[PDB]
Structure formats: C-alpha cells, structure tokens
Design an enzyme around this catalytic site. Structure first.
Site, PDB file in Angstrom:
ATOM      1  N   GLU A   1     -14.652 -14.896 -29.746  1.00 45.63           N
ATOM      2  CA  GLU A   1     -14.868 -13.482 -30.101  1.00 45.63           C
ATOM      3  C   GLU A   1     -15.201 -13.418 -31.578  1.00 45.63           C
ATOM      4  O   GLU A   1     -15.213 -14.430 -32.268  1.00 45.63           O
ATOM      5  CB  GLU A   1     -13.673 -12.645 -29.732  1.00 45.63           C
TER       6      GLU A   1
ATOM      7  N   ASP B   1     -18.342 -22.271 -27.052  1.00 49.63           N
ATOM      8  CA  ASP B   1     -19.322 -21.273 -27.438  1.00 49.63           C
ATOM      9  C   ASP B   1     -19.960 -20.720 -26.166  1.00 49.63           C
ATOM     10  O   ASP B   1     -21.068 -21.043 -25.775  1.00 49.63           O
ATOM     11  CB  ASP B   1     -20.384 -21.870 -28.374  1.00 49.63           C
TER      12      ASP B   1
ATOM     13  N   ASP C   1     -15.129  -5.762 -28.628  1.00 54.91           N
ATOM     14  CA  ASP C   1     -14.961  -4.451 -28.057  1.00 54.91           C
ATOM     15  C   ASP C   1     -15.229  -3.417 -29.146  1.00 54.91           C
ATOM     16  O   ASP C   1     -15.296  -3.766 -30.331  1.00 54.91           O
ATOM     17  CB  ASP C   1     -13.604  -4.242 -27.400  1.00 54.91           C
TER      18      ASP C   1
ATOM     19  N   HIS D   1     -18.212 -13.659 -27.642  1.00 54.23           N
ATOM     20  CA  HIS D   1     -17.732 -12.605 -26.785  1.00 54.23           C
ATOM     21  C   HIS D   1     -17.908 -11.287 -27.551  1.00 54.23           C
ATOM     22  O   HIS D   1     -17.002 -10.838 -28.263  1.00 54.23           O
ATOM     23  CB  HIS D   1     -16.298 -12.852 -26.429  1.00 54.23           C
TER      24      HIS D   1
END
Ligand SMILES: [Ca+2]
Ligand SMILES: [Ca+2]
Ligand SMILES: [Ca+2]
Ligand SMILES: [Zn+2]
EC number: 3.2.1.4
Lengths: 544, 63
Positions: free
Chosen positions: A522, A513, A168, A483
């Site tokens: 992530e 994965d 993010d 991610h």
C-alpha cells in the site's frame, strides 16, 4: 626525489547490469558516505564515469547480512566526490545502474514525494504530468460529511479537503497527526532550506511558501473535525461505512460520515493546530489565529477530561488508527502548546508527562507512538525555563538512540537503519528514523548521524535485497502495482508517482509488488511524510 | 485445535507456527505464520474475533 601520476585508464564496455549489485539508484552527495552491497563473491571494483574513465579502484569487503543470512560484499567509494554520472563496475559480476553524485541529487526526489501528496488531495480535481504521463481525477468527496453518528442528525457539515490517507480515500485524524507533525518538523528543522522551494502545486503563485501550501490543504480539513457542540472533542475520521472498490474517487458517491471522537484524535488535533498557528502566522495570520483558538478549545477539553477514550467506530469497517494510548499524544499536544504560546501551564504539563517516560526517545516510532515529536520540539525550543535535569535526560536518550541507529546501519549488510525489524509500514519507519538522526546532529554535530540518515534513504532507493526502489516513479525498478485505488482504476500502466510503499513483513524478503497486497504494497501519508522529512534535510544543502 | 477464519480462508490452529499481536491501521490484530503445504503463509484476524485457542497461543508466546 620524483613523483608523476600514471594516466587514467578507461573500461572495456562489455560490462552488463547485474541485479546482485545493489546501491542507491538516485545517487550520492559529495563529502558523504557512498556504498554498494554486492550479493556475489568479488574483490576489485571500479567507479566509472559515464564515458568509461575509471576514477576509483577499490576492494570490496565481505560482511555477513544477518537479516538475509547471506555473506555480501561491501564496496565503499565514499572518497569519490566529483559531481557527475557514474556506475560501479565489478569484475566477475557486472555493473550497477548509473547514479549521480551531486550536492542537489535528492531535490527531484523530494519534489516527486511532494507531488504524491498533491495527488492525494481530496475535494478537488488534481492534475499533473509526470515524466510525460498525465495523472488526473475530477473533484471527489465534495459532500463530506454527515453528522448522523455524531449527533443523530443527517446534517452535512463541511469536512472537505485534506489528503486521502492511503490506498483508500478515507481521512483519519490520528494518522494525520504523525504525518503533519513530521512534515511541520521538516519545516522547522530545515526552514532555510525549504522556505525558497517552489513546487508544482496550484498555489505556486500566492504569498505562501509552497511546502506550507501543501500542509494547509490538510490543516484546512483538520480544522473541520471539532464537534459542532463546541465541546472541543475531535471526530476520529471521515469515512464511508465500508471500504469502497477500486474506483476513481470522483466515482465514489457513497455518503461519508464524521466518526465519534477519541482522546488521541483530540490531542493530535491540538498538536497539529498549535504547530500550524506558529508556522502559518507570518503568511496568513488570520488563519493562524483560527488555529490557536481551536487548539485552545480542544486543549481545555483534554485538561478537564484526562481519561483515555477510544473512538466508537461501530458501523464502520475502514481504517481504525486506534492508538492504544493517548499519553504520548497528550505529551505532544502539551509540547506544541508550550512552543507556540509559552505559558507555564503547558510547560508544566509537558514536563510532568515527559518524566513518566522511562525511555525518552524510541528508535522505532510511527502513528501509534508520537511522543518523540514532543520530545523533539521541547529539546530544540529556544524558550527559557526548561528543567535542566529533564533536558539532560532527553538529550542522553536522543544521543544513545541515534548512536544505536548508526550501529544498526553500520552492521547491516544493506545499511538498513531499522535492522532486522519488519512490520506493516516499516519502510516508513526506516526513513522516519532520519528525524532522530537529524535532531541528534543538531544537538551534537556528528557526521555519522548524517551518513546514517543517508543510509536510510539509500535503503529505500535500491541498496536493499530486492535491488528496487520502494518509491513509485523513482529510481531502479520501482513498485508498479501498489494497493492504490487511483492506480488500479485509471487507464495508465504506471501507478501514480511519488509514493513510498509500506514494506514486507515479517521477513526481509516478504515484500510483494502486487495490487492485492495491502499488507506490504500500500501507500500512506505517514510513509510519504517520513520520506519527505528524510529528503528535506538534503534540499538546498551544501556539505562543504 | 480449531479453525481460524480470515479474509475468506480457514487455517487450523494446529498448522500455526508463530503468533503475535499488532496494532495495524485496520485495528488490533493477531498475526500469525502457518504451514501451507510446506510453504509458510502469513495471516491475521481481529483480536476481538480470534478463537480462545489462538488467543492461548498468543498468551504463551507473550509469556
Ligand atoms: Ca505558494
Ligand atoms: Ca498514542
Ligand atoms: Ca493504472
Ligand atoms: Zn476525495
């Protein structure tokens, strides 16, 4: 009476790669440990030059890997020290990937992990070509950030720059704490090694060492997080209200906000800015003065407001990084204030807090538990005045902990310094343990400590159950599907490079994965920072 | 036994095997393993959001 050596022999070229032969896919350093795990019955092995010449013949030894509950065979070829390219040939099994033996074997990997940080920058366009692939994005989050949740007013105060935290794009003070502290300690611990390092960054031609340029990009953001009221309280994060989609960051137009303060973010800000002040002073002393004055404002707040305060994150559903306690964070702040300034008050604050830790050094540490950072800076300080009994208590625990990590790695079938412990982000902790080991080695030089650090590194570069590098873009069969929003949203098959993925849990075979796996796959600044520290010790390094 | 809703899936507490507490980047969570048609799944829910029944299992596991 007479001794003459037999001719060197060459291999038959029928050896094929076999995924049961698991080793560090980057390589090894002369005069250090070199091991492979062979998850197949075997005995003899050969270390073979790229040209077929056999340079070493050994016998693999059986070992039970309690983690994966399998007997594996360990090939120890530590005695091979000549620089070059080699592979391991295991009759009856196959061969390993090629690897290098070199004093500078880890320098490219260090530079790539640093590239990952560059590529996480927020507030600016970024662009790099990595193995012929062009990774880029335009300027993002240039309207950071609004004050609505701080003081009710929809007023923008500049909070640009810094690094996107993870997969993010939001920016979190508490996770910056361990990230920046671990990277600043790489700088202090390995300063003569890192000071000359040139990096592929925009700041490559200024008067600042490039490692510090990268850190300055983060400190520049951190400095914006104090409350505008002048109280010294530090906003917890800059965030959108919810997690956005898998979009390139320049396409994320949702407003970003400062989130209400926490005591831990405030303490972490003190430690980071106090470190920044002493570290930047030779190169940008005006910036250093800004850093120390800011540190002092927030430390005054913390002195007058001793209670643990959790951020009010009402309205947000992004990362919390809600550390359970600020006692470690405040200990670290005091240590760094003391190290930078030297005042008795800081020393007294640190020593009073440190005495309340039954175990001075913890083997397993991350953003939630940063006390080790303070213990390290206090122990290694050249300043006079330290209580001798506290120093000895910290030393004893440091060495006991380091000795335990060596014992863990030596008795694990893949040299995993973290043993059988798996959790979200544990790959980061595997390499973060190199801090304990390297600090132990400074206090009590011991080759076992340095070789254990190399076991941590080897583990994340392919000496593991999966036979895979855990770092995008490096080594054997690296992660392809992190991610990670940039990776998911761009037009490029390979993901963005240089990132240590978090790791599988609860078990040793649970890493997937796949892009949907934020739990195991992530990326994060705190994971990269740990890898950077681990590799930093082996940059401009000579083991003779 | 009650249903545990997590991100949106539903697992009866009767199917849960191990339960433990973790402070993740997302907040405090109650993590768990469970029986999924003979395989083992993993899930987690916000601590603030967990039913009494799951929190009781956590308390037992912690005691
Ligand atoms: Ca520079
Ligand atoms: Ca803490
Ligand atoms: Ca992609
Ligand atoms: Zn951004």
């Amino acid at each position: 009476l007479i001794e003459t050596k037999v001719s060197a022999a060459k291999i038959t070229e029928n050896y094929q790669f076999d995924s049961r032969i698991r080793l560090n896919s980057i390589g090894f350093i002369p005069n250090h440990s070199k091991k492979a795990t062979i998850a197949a019955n075997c005995s003899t092995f050969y270390v073979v030059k790229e040209d077929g010449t056999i340079v070493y013949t050994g016998t693999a030894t059986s070992m039970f890997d309690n983690d994966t509950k399998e007997t594996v065979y360990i090939a120890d070829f530590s005695s091979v020290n000549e620089e070059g390219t080699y592979y391991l040939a295991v009759p009856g099994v196959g061969k390993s990937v090629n690897f290098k033996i070199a004093m500078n074997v880890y320098e490219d990997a260090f530079k790539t992990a640093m590239l990952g940080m560059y590529l996480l920058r927020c507030g600016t366009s970024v662009s790099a070509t990595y193995n012929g692939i062009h990774y880029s994005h335009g300027p993002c989050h240039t309207n950071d950030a609004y004050l609505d949740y701080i003081n009710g007013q929809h007023t923008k105060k500049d909070s640009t720059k810094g690094w996107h935290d993870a997969g993010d794009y939001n920016k979190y003070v508490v996770n910056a704490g361990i990230t920046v502290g671990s990277m600043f300690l790489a700088w202090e611990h390995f300063k003569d090694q890192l000071e000359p390092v040139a990096l592929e960054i925009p700041e490559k031609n200024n008067s600042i060492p490039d490692f510090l340029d990268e850190l300055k990009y983060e400190i520049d953001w951190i400095l914006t997080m104090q409350y505008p009221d002048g109280s010294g309280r530090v906003a917890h994060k800059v965030s959108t209200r919810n997690f956005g989609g898998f979009i390139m960051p320049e396409n994320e137009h949702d407003e970003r906000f400062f989130v209400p303060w926490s005591s831990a973010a405030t303490a972490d800000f003190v430690a980071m800015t106090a470190m920044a002040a002493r570290i930047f002073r030779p190169y940008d002393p005006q910036y250093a003065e800004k850093c120390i004055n800011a540190a002092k404002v927030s430390y005054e707040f913390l002195k007058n407001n001793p209670a643990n305060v959790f951020a009010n994150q009402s309205g947000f559903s992004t990362g919390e990084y809600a550390t359970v306690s600020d006692a470690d964070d405040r200990l670290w702040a005091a240590a760094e204030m003391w190290e930078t300034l030297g005042d008795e008050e800081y020393l007294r604050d640190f020593e009073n807090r440190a005495a309340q830790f039954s175990k001075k050094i913890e083997a397993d540490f991350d953003w939630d538990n940063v006390a080790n950072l303070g213990m390290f800076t206090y122990l290694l300080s050249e300043r006079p005045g330290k209580n001798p009994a506290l120093v000895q208590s910290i030393k004893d625990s440091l060495l006991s902990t380091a000795d335990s990590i060596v014992r863990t790695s030596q008795n694990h079938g893949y040299g995993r310094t973290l043993g059988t412990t798996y959790y979200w982000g544990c790959n980061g902790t595997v390499v973060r343990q190199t801090m304990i080991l390297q600090v132990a080695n400074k206090i009590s030089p011991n080759n076992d400590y340095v070789n254990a650090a190399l076991d941590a590194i080897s583990h994340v570069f392919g000496r593991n159950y999966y036979n895979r590098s855990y770092v995008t873009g490096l080594g054997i069969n690296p992660p392809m599907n992190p991610h990670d929003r940039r990776s998911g949203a761009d037009g490029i098959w390979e993901p963005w490079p240089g990132y240590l993925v978090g790791g599988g849990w609860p078990g040793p075979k649970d890493w997937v994965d796949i892009q949907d796996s934020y739990q195991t796959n992530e990326i994060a600044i705190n994971w990269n920072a740990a890898l950077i520290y681990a590799l930093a010790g082996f940059v401009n390094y000579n083991s003779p | 036994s009650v249903k545990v809703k997590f991100h949106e899936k539903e697992v009866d507490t009767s199917k849960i095997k191990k339960v433990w507490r973790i402070n993740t980047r997302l907040g405090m969570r109650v993590a768990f393993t469970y029986d999924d048609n003979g395989k083992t799944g993993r899930g987690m829910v916000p601590e603030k959001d967990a039913p009494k029944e799951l929190l009781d299992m956590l308390a037992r596991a912690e005691g």
